[model samples]
Target: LTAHARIREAAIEQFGRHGFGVGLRAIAEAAGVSAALVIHHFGSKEGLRKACDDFVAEEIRSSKAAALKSNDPTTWLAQMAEIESYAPLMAYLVRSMQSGGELAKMLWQKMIDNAEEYLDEGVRAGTVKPSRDPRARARFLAITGGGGFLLYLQMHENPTDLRAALRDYAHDMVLPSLEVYTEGLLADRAMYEAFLAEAQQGEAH
Candidate 1:
């Protein structure tokens, strides 16, 4: 394979398996190259990962960014829930939790940093709610995303229809609260309380 292709593959494998902390040399071996080449190509291991993060962020950014741009309170939610439609990242995260340490910390930390800032910007732009703490909402977004991952991991494979599940997962878990935020905070309390009641009804329907 070409040099760039070789380096990229090695980096993806190491990062995917060992996360960002795997030494440059180990990555080089995994890539079948000399240690000096790793530095030549990526500078430091962290730099290489910063490079990778750029890609990962872009992949995640495209959809969520589009949702944010639509600036509709109602739209913000399905788009968020739609993220779970992808399985690999969720699968990797599941395995990463079992792996532990900086790996886990790296995963959560990056999520926390980007998520809060994005929501805050959305609020400032008059798209998200200003009343609730941006940090709380942002972290809650991260929590729901992770919860989606866990659900997919634990889900029993059967012929069961997920229309109800998807509807509940999206509406009750993340959307309603966010929808409240988008609404000018006037009707939010009752809407959210009613959302709680309707959310329970999701299981029965």
Candidate 2:
């Protein structure tokens, strides 16, 4: 990898493993480069952090897009399996969110925006069911999905390996998630129809 790529990769791993308090010199050491070179490449520690954030976002987006475009369940499962490779990125995300500042808000907003973008694409491609309120649906999914992930991470008493924990989480949850997405939980739409009728009645009155 290029020096820039190597530095960013190392930074992601370091920051993920030890939080952003990790020094640039340590990242440089991990990347097998000088601290001066790290500064020259990224300008500052915050700049390096931003670069790592951007890289992880784009990596996830492209992989998700590819799976969505394929419109195949097998492709989706394949991507889920590949998520093991993104363990560090996932850890970084959780740490950033836990840090709770502008960075956290920015990342959360980006996730919601990304979800909307892909949901729109999927709807257009006829791969996703259209929602009555697309933006709300996107926001809801983003919040709940991220919230559940954070809770799951916290549930582990003392995970020795974040990658293994994440892999097991996926293994344990993927089936149920897919089942809900594919077949839904409700046996029929009676409750939905009733709600719609009541809403319409209220509107008419």
Candidate lDDT (C-alpha), each: 0.61, 0.83
Query: Which number leads on TM-score?
Result: 2
The local lDDT score (0 to 100) that residue 64 gets in candidate 2 is 65
What tens-digit string does per-residue lDDT give for candidate 1 at 1-205? 3776587667766665565566777889998989998788778766675565454555555556556656675776566556445333333344455656564667667767777766666666766567445777778878877665457535634312333444445545565655554454664477777876786799679
Poorest 10 consecutive residues by lDDT, candidate 2:
153-162
CA displacement after TM-score superposition, residue 148 of candidate 1 (Å): 2.7
The model with the greatest lDDT is: 2
Deviation in Å, model 1, residue 194 alpha carbon:
15
RMSD of each: 9.9, 2.4
lDDT of 1 at 128: 58
